Amino acid sequence: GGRDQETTGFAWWSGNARLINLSGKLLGAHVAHAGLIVFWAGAMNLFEVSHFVPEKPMYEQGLILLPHIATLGYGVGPGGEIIDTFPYFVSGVLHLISSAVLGFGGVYHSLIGPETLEESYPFFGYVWKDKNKMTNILGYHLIMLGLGAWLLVWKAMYFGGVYDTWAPGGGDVRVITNPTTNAAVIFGYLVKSPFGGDGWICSVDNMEDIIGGHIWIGTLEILGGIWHIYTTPWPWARRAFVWSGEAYLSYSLGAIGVMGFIACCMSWFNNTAYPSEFYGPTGPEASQSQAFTFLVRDQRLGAGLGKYLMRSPTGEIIFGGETMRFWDFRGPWLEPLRGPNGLDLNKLKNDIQPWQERRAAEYMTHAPLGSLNSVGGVATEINAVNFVSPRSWLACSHFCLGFFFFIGHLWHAGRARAAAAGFEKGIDRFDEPVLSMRPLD
Amino acid sequence: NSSLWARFCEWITSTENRLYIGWFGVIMIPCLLTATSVFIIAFIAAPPVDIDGIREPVSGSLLYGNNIITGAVIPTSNAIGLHFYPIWEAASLDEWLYNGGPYQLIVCHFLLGVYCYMGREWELSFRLGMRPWIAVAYSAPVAAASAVFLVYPIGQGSFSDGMPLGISGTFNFMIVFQAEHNILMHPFHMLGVAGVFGGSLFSAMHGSLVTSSLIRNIVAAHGYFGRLIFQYASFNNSRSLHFFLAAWPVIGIWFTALGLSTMAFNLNGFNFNQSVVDSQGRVLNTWADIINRANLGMEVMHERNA
């Protein structure tokens, strides 16, 4: 029951653009899309559970969703061992049925319902040029996101625990009790540098910092939502922005693309919120595992130091060879052996633990190297082995999506500004702004 | 309105200037000037750089006994990696040069400059009344430059992997990249080369048709095209034709840039080795296998273990 090209001026390939003014159709579209997202979540969870064996680590069979639930700490024992698989199945089926409900609601709103909600439902109605109602909706959804963040904090602090990978003797599920709520450390990450050795927010190491940050962000979101419900934009705010649907979409696109890039970097580098036991080692982690395992083998067989060790430009003792570029790597199986001045010889000479050795072996064998043809190893690998680390998949996919959504921001922001100015359709062919200017010589 | 701020703003935003400045120009201009000055000075004269960080300097400056096709600004030394290395973090100016800071300076300023250039393109488009999205078309080369100079080093964890700012350096980078990853046998690079070839083809064909039609007509050119091959109803109006011309190369370059960034995280191209096997298990070589032999040669040759 769509409109014609003549009636709206938008061809079929620009069809959804006809929904800008209509509210009911747009609302149904949004609800149906949310249902689609949840449907994919549930279906992927069910399929991944169906093709999962608890014996092997999850990173060896291309698992991307179950590691998240494991990080939350469901059916996970010490060292990342799998205890029970029922939590994953229940999560997937719950997601899928909720998706069914959302899809029904979206179809009902999109197909048979008030195309415009303003006339009959003043509470839910809105107009793009309006400002107070936009702030009200923004506040509602800010409150919702704050409630979600506080739900995560409640789960971490009560009713179970999260899988901490920094626990002694390997990672395990732990219950947080004293999250770092100091503002100084919380915002130091936000002010930290983004270059090598600093990493901006990607350098978080302890789950304490994660929980503290989530507490702060949830409280801030709740307060901001309450503020925006009862407040109208300032005079300068109304003077520096374009208040139309496409402009809102443009700002959202820019924000979401930036967050996509940030998440790509976090997935590639960070290992606290992404335990190596589930997602697998990162590139620097694999290189350092290579160096550490080779040093251990050399020390065992032969039985700063010239064997695989050198001095960094700063001065600390670091692993030698091409691995020196990753001298800033930190991990649970390598932290105990590192003294204040980098790696101290006495630690590796005496302080060695078997689980560290086998973890290093299992990480060095499974380096984050692969091919689009699902063949692990370097591109010039003569034989065939099936392996591609999930971290590479996440990073590549989310980088591509972030870049495309940034391009979307550019396009939509340009179009919205042009439309607001009033010359988006084209030049008036009578009063060209260029003609009113002197010739350029 | 004689206040310093007022007149300075009017001068900045005025179209009376020979080259439009705009506010994006404020960051655009000085960044590119710094980049080009440092690049010229380094290319003309500069000491060797320790690209691999094992005390084996690589001459790359014009004055140090090398040619235009061989001169290049060596990338940052492998020892530093991703650490931020301005002048004021180096122990001394000589050490700064030996390690290879000017490449980092040039690349940072250049990336800022190109982004600001995109911004000013949009801003003047808005000023003159024309439609805004020319910056979208410009996003292809900018995306490729960002992928080559910034994203790939980030993926590999070191700034020494960025493209050297030279010609022979560019060839070395391309060859080493083929060795490490099969750039040739990757669908996104295939899309990129398809985009480039199609852009050349369409430019040539459109120029020929339009210049032949301009006699003293568009219907005649349309009939000519429709009779030369069997698609008579092809690009009836100029709007669709020119939009297609804009769209093809831009999408091609977007895809090749995305492919390069994808490989930055070690997701290589297709790996067709021992794909064909006869009975009772032998290996029959295919063209992919000769390509693999060449890749193995380059890979084992570039890696200086000693």
Binding site: - | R18, L19, I44, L62
Partner: peptide
């Protein structure tokens, strides 16, 4: 002395670019 020749060529080319920018022939 080849270096001086190379710099001369590059600077000359840059001069051609500069003159093409700022000293354009007005149309017709």
């Amino acid at each position: 002395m080849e270096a001086l020749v190379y710099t001369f060529l590059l600077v000359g080319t840059l001069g051609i670019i500069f003159f093409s920018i700022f000293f354009r022939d007005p149309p017709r």
